[PDB]
Design a protein around this ligand. Structure first.
Ligand SMILES: [Zn+2]
Ligand SMILES: [Zn+2]
Ligand SMILES: [Zn+2]
Lengths: 89, 66, 426, 486, 829
């Protein structure tokens, strides 16, 4: 249904909207935003520039992995922009 | 998980497991300086030739399979 | 009985794993950025007194696996790209006013450790500073593009994938192309067939391939453009200066041989590694090079390649038109086995021995104008060339840096009449 | 020692000289030495100079012939018995006979017989230290025993071994059955193929070390089936580790008689150290093994072992229950027996030993020693490493200091992260998670931060940056070298 | 089956709506609706179809390909992402069609070249991308031969887009490949439109290539330099503009390459007028920052005469060009400040600082930024003094311009350069300019607060007058401008504290306190913000509204619907709770706690974090001895318990929280399990001393009971394991592992993924060695169901800390056919 992008992340910083403002992209934990999120160039292109990493709304802050994910190096997988396996709209 | 080299599954043979950990070990020797130093001191060979033989042992280790 | 400890270092590691040279201070002076095990160190050899002073020493708390320097076009200061056991690549800039390494860039691509398929072991840079390639021992290779902004500050790009499954990398080297698309030559070896043949026949007759990866800048993608198998396995390469200075190409050092193999219509040129007269070693044992130093001049260029016996040769390439005619080697001198060598302007050679003390010599003579035999690839023989080792006659020992590596035993006791115990180190 | 007291910015310094004892000195000034010191020592006159002002570990080097593996302190002679072993090497006799053999084969070319290049080849022995060692062979070796006085650079005795013999252990002790005569036992191996591993056998040389540690004379050479790489004096007798077999040996007139044996050790014995009653064995891969020796039957009983595999390199007993061990992969651990361990018994063993300290140094440690570095200070766990570095491990005296330096570590981990993108806690938790160690090399980088960061970190600890710096200096004042003279 | 079709897709994919077979080239088109599968579809459809159309790219031919792609790329209803996909497939088919695209090159360009001038930036990068790939598929001579006739076209539009396209192909094939073409066209004798077009190609090569010119900069400059002396004014103008573009891209390097251009330009400065003089002056302005110090002095002095003359030019483009040139000259290190003070400033402020310059926005920005940059080199006072008297102008916009200028200057340099006279002129001009406001100018606010904070303690003699104006404006204009004065108080409170005028902040305190009944929420938020800024610096006993009175007035404001009012109010409550909670009784504090408990669920992050902080402060003041044991929606109470256990030791709340588990009801046991999970995850390292206490609860709950007990309990083990990692708790965590391991075999995805996460946490905290030890048995177990799970766990332990496993792999002896011993690690020195 939903899956991470997991492509090679580049220099594009991932954003978060006002509703999804304080969660880790992976585990939804609100505690200790530790490491900044990078996203691949394709997911950050055109209309998707500055969009949210979780839900895809207008981003108002920066996305962070939690401390637990940084300890487990979950920040060092592919870029974590959630994609629905449905249409491209 | 499947696309990470060294990952295993239910039908993984002992030969695959030990060639995996053997290649892992050789690359770890290539990385850690004092490990390659200990090995290059044990056998009286320079660091360069020890690294070279460690690279030759990459498709060779555990010999051919069954 | 709670036992909490507290670690401290009294004598930092003296063994050198890497050594690069350049204008790291941003002036005419050349410095030597060496890497001990887990410590990055900036040294300055004095052209006056000939002594090596440690300008800076920083503990990086990580395993340094590759060390390169580069410079952008029109630049006057060399940066420091460091491949580590982290999943990150870092570009650093030394600051003389603050005496510290300013981390300019740091990009995260993999997991931590000296891993098999996580890059950080190999690091090759385009000689014009346009791109850097960090690669693992197997299967993964990444390329970043380096461009300065309007404020003249270095900027890095997103990584470009150059992966190739079931591939082992012996050595990576950036090719000196005259502002053409950047080229990265490397030694590869595909083991996919050797693992699917229970007879072992695919294991044999499987030789490594010299492969040229091109960075298409106009299309922004890396492609395995070129590849050719090698006659025998090589240990490392040497960047041959190209463009306006010299012909582009790479030198492949190999078991008992050296092979200039530029791609295109350039024919492979090979020369046997000269051996000392009356070797006491077992004739079944081969001979490889352990390291190489490169010196580039507006007028000429040469190389210094050291063997397992510490034999430094001055390798020179004669050329006609844009093609190379022959590889001319000449016996330069002998020093202890070095893990790295640096040829500096004003005539100085820094030899960082793989074990024991390090040395700094002054280049008195280039190694030519003597009557010693000079061997060439064009000379026919079938048998190798032989030479006579002699005391230091092209270099003079100017400084010696005491290194305790490797320490195999240690007894801290008061064997002398003094009161403070001494460290008796075998 | 000769100490130099000098004021520096209205702040005195009393720094000792890395030099032998001297009897007198006076200021000196010549064109050869503009600012020096004329010092007379016992039966010698010396013109010296103090060029460098910073205090460091200074050295005096005694050249050797082969790679040293171990040396032992002779209590009476205060001299050293060193074993020097090298792979791929020729013994001196083989160098002579092979060089000469080449000389003979030179004439057989029958070239007009009139050319004696052997007169130039056999004459010049190229300096082996600079032109590299003429050494080759996969089964070939070269091992040498040496008696050296540590005061000067002279070698008292030299014993060259056979062609394919390689010494890996050595010890100096006396036996209960004999008098106060000092014996030197040297463990040697024969025909070592290192990769793949295959051995033909081992030997144990015994020497009489007469003339208060000045000469070695051959007593006997007792053979054995596997390489013995561990020799330790134990209750008037000698504990020898041959392969995975730990044996109790006594001295005999013809050979070293085997008095006891234990063969339940897992893999291979790399080292052995013993408190007066217990035996601490170092397996090559399976960490430390606790072995008790029953005096009544001569029966070695394994009463404890480790729960983790450790590629041990060296170790030292901190007390009757704790061992500090080094790692091939650059780690250091401290393992402690629980206080309820029963010494007299008869997945490996029943009662296990808990690991109370884990810490990744980052450089492979090959010597651990608990000793006091300077007079008046406290004991420290000084270690050496394979990269030519010297470090120390230091105990905390109060919980307040432990919490202090620990919070310093936590702060500098985030405010001063490692330069090459590495995680400090992950780096020190390389193979095992950190257990009760504070990285002082990280803490002392407090002085390298920007002043605003020093102010933030110090104010978070309710201190000032100078207070933090001094409290960091106190550790070096207590356990290391501090030459500040108020 | 076909994907969904949009109405605009019928025109392009109508022929799939009917089942046909057996057609030819109709087979081609039909199988080419593969394009429809790529455009509309799922990522699997787009990738599989993409690979199918790339593999058969040669078999299909370029003709039909572009014949069906270009109409799609031309559809006005095309989305941007769909256009990006079309670009990707265009590149991927162009890579295969190496030579076949030549006869179609023109047919592509006439469709793509418009995208190079589109207002959409991403569309422009699409056109550049596909034109580059087109330039690499076809040859260089193909692009040159195709695009050469449009060089001297009479229409300026096609010449412009043609030059841009040539810049794109220059970026694709490299500068040296196109160097001779430019060297020929820039000297074309047939018409001036050709040379003008090639010079435009050089300029667009500057704009597009950027700093990648530097190696070929001398080549381009030599190819283009002759255009400065041509008899056509247009080619001279475009040549000077292209020189300016090359200098802009080469900044700051490459001054040598422009050598052969320095003298001509200079001479032209004396014999050119109009917009060609503007182009030459622009090239000078972009060339000077590239030069050394002495030569910048010489050259800048060599052009300053004509520059000063053109300070009063009637053209607007001229004034802006020469203004940028002034900024660039006075930004260079060679132009000393004394020279600027003597020869540049008088005509600058005479001709450029006029009332008509404040009306235009471009003149406004250009003049302000240029003026501040002048102040960066010639000093602060030397620039500010010349425009202070203009703070008293009747024209409000002029006061806005000089106010913004002074604000940026003093914000950059400070106030140490200002003497007493200029200081009083500042206070006067800022007071007068701030009083007569037609609207709420944020520029006057930033300028007032910036000048005040810059003066620091020097503003003490003026604080009575300042606070007088702030009170007058604070009661004036009927609530419309009150929040501006409140923001001013909030921005100057600290300086009012460092000037020993606390009673004046007291008058501001009572006046602000008497406005908390404000109906406009946006103003009330600024009132609460000003109160917060005063409380942060004032002594708790000097607050003229006593905290005993201030806090109960703040307690009902927490029900306000506005986000700003909630944030500022909560923050003020927290500052009171942190500094002077001794003035408020415990009953009030408790009532505030349960006036804020629901706000921990607020959607805005600022309000959540604020409520967490202030809840921690009031919990620190009260103490955890008396809080409610537990009360419908447990999430805010869970975060509450975590906060209380973080500000005060969890030794106080863990006994009661574990006491709530002893009751036989189940959902409350799951509740205390969740609160334990978020508890340990929140406290992190503080749980190093509280694991043995919670061990038995996790023993019972961890055992098979309810699947949820095992799930959330495993989550507890995970959070404890990750928060305590690195503090010597291997015995306890290793003890709970013995209980978590029985739950390894389970099929419910949530609980098995929670158990896996607990195994990864226990991996980082215990070490990969122990995890591999537990994981070794079932790797080669005869049963497959156990090999799946144990191999899965082994994968989790292998992906993380693979380099660490090198030391923990067990010894496996070599069999007859293989060598399985790592002999290197068995070496002993
Ligand atoms: Zn969102
Ligand atoms: Zn993505
Ligand atoms: Zn997370």
């Amino acid at each position: 249904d939903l899956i991470f992008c997991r492509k090679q992340a580049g220099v594009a910083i991932g954003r978060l909207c006002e509703k999804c403002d304080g969660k880790c992209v992976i585990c939804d934990s609100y505690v200790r935003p530790c490491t900044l999120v990078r996203i691949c160039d394709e997911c950050n292109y055109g209309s998707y520039q500055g969009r949210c990493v979780i839900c895809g709304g207008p981003g108002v802050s920066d996305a962070y992995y939690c401390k637990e994910c940084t300890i487990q190096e979950k920040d060092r997988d592919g870029c974590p922009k959630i994609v629905n396996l449905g249409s491209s709209k | 998980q499947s696309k990470y080299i060294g990952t295993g599954h239910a039908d993984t043979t002992k030969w695959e497991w030990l060639v995996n950990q053997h290649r892992d070990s050789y690359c770890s020797y290539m990385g850690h300086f004092d490990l390659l130093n200990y090995f290059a001191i044990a056998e009286n060979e320079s660091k360069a030739r020890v690294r070279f033989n460690l690279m030759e042992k990459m498709l060779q280790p555990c010999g051919p399979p069954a | 009985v709670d036992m909490f400890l507290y670690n401290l270092t009294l004598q930092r590691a003296t063994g050198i794993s890497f050594a690069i040279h350049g204008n790291f201070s941003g002036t005419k002076q050349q410095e030597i950025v060496v890497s001990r095990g887990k410590i990055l160190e900036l040294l300055r050899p004095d052209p006056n007194t000939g002594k090596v002073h440690t300008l800076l020493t920083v503990e990086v708390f990580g395993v340094i696996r590759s060390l390169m320097a580069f410079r952008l076009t029109g630049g006057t200061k060399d940066y420091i790209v460091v491949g580590s056991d982290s999943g990150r690549i870092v570009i650093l800039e030394y600051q003389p006013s603050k005496n510290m390494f300013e981390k300019i860039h740091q990009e995260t691509f993999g997991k931590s450790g000296c891993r098999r398929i996580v890059p950080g072991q190999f690091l090759a840079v385009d000689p014009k500073g346009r791109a850097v390639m960090i690669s693992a021992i197997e299967k993964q290779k990444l390329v970043y593009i380096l461009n300065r902004d309007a404020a003249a500050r270095l900027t890095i790009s997103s990584p470009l994938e150059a992966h190739k499954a079931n591939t082992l990398v012996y050595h990576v080297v950036g090719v000196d192309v005259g502002f053409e698309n950047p080229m990265f030559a490397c030694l590869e070896m595909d083991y996919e067939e050797a693992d699917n043949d229970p007879t072992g026949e695919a294991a044999a007759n499987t030789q490594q391939t010299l492969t040229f990866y091109e960075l298409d800048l106009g299309l922004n993608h890396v492609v395995r453009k070129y590849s050719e198998p090698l006659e025998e396995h090589g240990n490392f390469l040497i960047t041959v200066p190209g463009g306006s200075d010299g012909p582009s190409g790479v030198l492949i050092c190999s078991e008992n041989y050296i092979t200039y193999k530029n791609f295109g219509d350039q024919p492979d040129i090979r020369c046997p590694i000269p051996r000392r007269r009356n070797d006491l070693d077992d004739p079944e044992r081969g001979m490889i090079f352990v390291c190489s130093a490169t010196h580039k001049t507006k007028s000429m260029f040469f190389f210094l390649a050291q063997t397992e016996q510490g034999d430094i040769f001055k390798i020179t390439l004669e050329t006609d038109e844009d093609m190379v005619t022959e590889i001319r080697l000449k016996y330069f001198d002998t020093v202890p086995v070095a893990a790295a060598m640096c040829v500096l302007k004003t005539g100085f050679l820094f030899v960082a021995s793989e074990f024991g003390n390090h040395y700094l010599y002054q280049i008195a003579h280039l190694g030519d104008d003597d009557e010693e035999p000079e061997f060439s690839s064009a000379m026919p023989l079938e048998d190798t060339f032989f030479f006579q080792p002699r005391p230091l006659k092209n270099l003079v020992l100017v400084d010696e840096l005491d290194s305790l590596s490797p320490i195999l035993f240690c007894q801290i006791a008061d064997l002398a009449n003094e009161d403070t115990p001494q460290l008796y180190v075998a | 020692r000769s100490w130099l007291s000098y004021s520096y910015q209205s702040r005195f310094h009393l720094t000792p000289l890395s030099y032998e004892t001297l009897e007198f000195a006076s200021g000196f000034a010549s064109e050869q030495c503009p600012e020096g010191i004329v010092a007379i020592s016992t039966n010698t006159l010396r013109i010296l100079a103090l060029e460098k002002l910073g205090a460091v570990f200074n050295q005096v080097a005694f050249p050797l012939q082969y790679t040293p593996r171990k040396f032992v302190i002779h209590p009476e002679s205060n001299n050293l018995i060193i074993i020097e072993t090298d792979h791929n090497a020729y013994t001196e006799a083989t160098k002579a006979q092979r060089k000469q053999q080449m000389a003979e084969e030179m004439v057989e070319a029958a070239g007009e017989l009139a050319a004696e290049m052997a007169a130039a080849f056999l004459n010049e022995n190229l300096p082996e230290s600079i032109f590299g060692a003429p050494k080759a062979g996969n089964g070939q070796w070269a091992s040498v025993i040496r008696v050296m006085n540590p005061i000067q650079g002279n070698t008292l005795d030299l014993v060259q071994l056979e062609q394919n013999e390689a010494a890996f252990s050595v010890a100096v002790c006396r036996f209960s059955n004999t008098g106060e005569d000092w014996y030197v036992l040297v463990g040697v191996a024969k025909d070592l193929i290192l990769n793949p591993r295959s051995v033909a056998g081992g030997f144990v040389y015994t020497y009489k070390l007469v003339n208060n540690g000045e000469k070695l004379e051959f007593l006997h050479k007792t053979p054995v089936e596997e390489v013995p790489a561990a020799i330790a004096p134990f209750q008037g007798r000698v504990l020898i580790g041959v392969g995975k077999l730990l044996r109790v040996y006594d001295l005999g007139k013809k050979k070293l008689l085997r008095k006891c044996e234990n063969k339940h050790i897992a893999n291979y014995i790399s080292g052995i150290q013993t408190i007066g009653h217990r035996v601490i064995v170092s397996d090559v891969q399976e960490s430390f093994i606790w072995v008790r020796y029953k005096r009544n039957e001569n029966q070695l009983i394994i009463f404890a072992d480790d729960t983790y595999p450790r590629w041990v390199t060296t170790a030292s007993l901190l007390d009757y229950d704790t061992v500090a061990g080094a790692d091939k992969f650059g780690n250091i651990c401290v393992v402690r027996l629980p206080p309820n361990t029963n010494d007299e018994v008869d997945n490996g063993a029943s009662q296990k030993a808990e690991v109370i300290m884990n810490y990744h140094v980052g450089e492979t440690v090959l010597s651990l020693q608990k000793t006091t570095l300077i007079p008046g200070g406290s004991e420290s766990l000084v270690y050496t490493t394979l990269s030519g570095g010297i470090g120390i491990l230091v105990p905390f005296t109060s919980h307040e200091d432990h919490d202090f330096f620990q919070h310093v570590e936590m702060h500098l981990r985030s405010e001063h992260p490692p330069l090459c993108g590495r995680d400090h806690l992950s780096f020190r938790s390389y193979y095992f998670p950190v257990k009760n160690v504070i990285d002082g090399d990280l803490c002392e980088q407090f002085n390298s931060m920007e002043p605003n960061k020093q102010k933030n970190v110090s104010e978070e600890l309710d201190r000032t940056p100078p207070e933090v710096s001094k409290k960091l200096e106190d550790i070096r004042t207590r356990y290391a070298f501090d030459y500040k003279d108020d | 089956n076909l994907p969904f079709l949009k109405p605009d897709d019928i025109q392009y994919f109508d022929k799939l709506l009917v089942d046909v077979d057996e057609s030819e080239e109709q087979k081609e088109r039909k199988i080419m609706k593969l394009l429809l599968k790529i455009k509309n579809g799922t990522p699997p459809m787009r990738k599989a179809a993409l690979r199918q159309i790339t593999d058969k790219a040669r078999e299909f031919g370029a003709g039909p390909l572009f014949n069906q792609i270009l109409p799609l790329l031309m559809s006005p209803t095309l989305e941007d992402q769909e256009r990006h996909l079309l670009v990707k497939v265009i590149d991927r088919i162009l890579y295969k069609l190496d030579d076949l695209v030549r006869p179609y090159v023109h047919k592509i360009l006439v469709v793509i070249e418009p995208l190079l001038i589109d207002e959409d930036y991403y569309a422009r990068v699409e056109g550049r991308e596909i034109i580059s790939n087109l330039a690499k598929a076809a040859g260089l001579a193909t692009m040159i031969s195709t695009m050469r006739p449009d060089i001297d076209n009479m229409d300026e539009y096609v010449r412009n887009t043609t030059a841009r396209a040539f810049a794109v192909v220059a970026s694709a094939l490299g500068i040296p490949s196109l160097l001779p073409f430019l060297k020929a066209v820039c000297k074309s004798k047939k018409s001036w439109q050709a040379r003008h077009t090639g010079i435009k190609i050089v300029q667009q090569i500057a704009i597009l290539m950027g700093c990648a010119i530097l190696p070929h900069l001398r080549s381009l400059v030599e190819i283009i330099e002759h255009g400065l002396v041509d008899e056509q004014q247009k080619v001279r103008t475009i040549s000077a503009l292209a020189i300016a573009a090359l200098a802009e891209a080469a900044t700051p390097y490459g001054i040598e390459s422009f050598d052969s251009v320095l003298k001509p330009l200079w001479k032209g400065i004396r014999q050119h007028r109009g917009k060609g003089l503007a182009a030459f002056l622009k090239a000078i302005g972009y060339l000077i920052p590239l030069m050394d110090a002495e030569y910048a002095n010489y050259y800048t002095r060599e052009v300053m005469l004509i520059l000063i003359r053109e300070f009063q030019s009637p053209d607007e483009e001229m004034k802006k060009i020469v203004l940028k040139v002034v900024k660039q000259c006075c930004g260079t290190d060679g132009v000393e400040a004394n020279y600027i003070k003597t020869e540049i400033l008088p005509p600058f402020f005479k001709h450029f600082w006029q009332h008509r310059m404040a009306l235009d926005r471009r003149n406004y920005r250009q003049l302000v930024d240029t003026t501040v940059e002048l102040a960066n080199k010639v000093g602060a006072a030397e620039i500010i003094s010349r425009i202070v008297d203009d703070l008293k102008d009747e024209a409000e916009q002029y006061r806005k311009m000089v106010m913004e200028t002074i604000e940026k200057i003093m914000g950059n340099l400070g106030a140490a350069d200002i003497d007493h006279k200029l200081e009083e002129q500042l206070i006067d001009g800022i007071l007068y300019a701030f009083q007569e406001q037609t609207t709420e100018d944020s520029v006057m606010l930033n300028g007032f607060g910036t000048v005040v904070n810059a003066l620091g303690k020097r503003v003490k003699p003026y604080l009575p007058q300042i606070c007088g104006t702030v009170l007058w404006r604070l009661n004036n204009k009927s609530a419309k401008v009150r929040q501006q004065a409140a923001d001013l108080i909030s921005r100057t409170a600290v300086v009012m504290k460092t000037c020993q005028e606390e009673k004046l902040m007291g008058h501001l305190g009572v006046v602000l306190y008497e406005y908390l009944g404000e109906e406009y929420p946006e103003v009330l938020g600024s009132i609460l913000g000003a109160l917060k800024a005063i409380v942060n610096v004032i002594g708790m006993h000097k607050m003229t509204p006593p905290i005993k009175d201030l806090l109960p007035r703040l307690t009902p404001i927490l029900k306000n619907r506005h986000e700003k009012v909630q944030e500022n109010c909560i923050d003020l409550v927290g500052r009171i709770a942190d500094r002077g909670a001794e003035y408020v009784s415990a009953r009030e504090w408790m009532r505030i706690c349960f006036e804020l408990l629901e706000l921990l669920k607020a959607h805005k992050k600022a309000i959540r974090r604020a409520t967490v902080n202030t809840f921690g402060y009031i919990a620190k003041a009260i103490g955890p001895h008396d809080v409610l044991a537990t009360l419908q929606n447990r999430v805010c109470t869970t975060v509450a318990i975590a906060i209380v256990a973080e500000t005060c030791s969890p030794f106080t709340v863990l006994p009661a929280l574990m006491n709530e588990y002893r009751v036989p009801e189940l959902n409350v046991q799951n509740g205390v399990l969740k609160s334990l999970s978020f508890l340990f995850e929140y406290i992190g390292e503080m749980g190093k001393d509280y694991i043995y206490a919670v061990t038995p609860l996790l023993e019972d709950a961890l055992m098979d009971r309810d699947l949820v007990h095992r799930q959330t309990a495993s989550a507890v083990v995970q959070h404890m394991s990750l928060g305590v990692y690195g503090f010597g708790c291997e015995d306890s965590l290793n003890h709970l592992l013995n209980y978590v391991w029985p739950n390894v075999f389970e099929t419910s995805p949530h609980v098995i993924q929670a158990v896996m996460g607990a195994l990864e946490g226990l991996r980082v905290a215990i070490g990969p060695c122990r995890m591999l030890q537990y994981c070794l048995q079932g790797l080669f177990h005869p049963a497959r169901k156990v090999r799946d799970v144990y191999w899965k766990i082994y994968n989790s332990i292998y992906i993380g800390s693979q380099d660490a496993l090198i030391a923990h792999y067990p010894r496996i002896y070599n069999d007859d056919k293989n060598t399985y011993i790592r002999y290197e690690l068995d070496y002993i020195l």
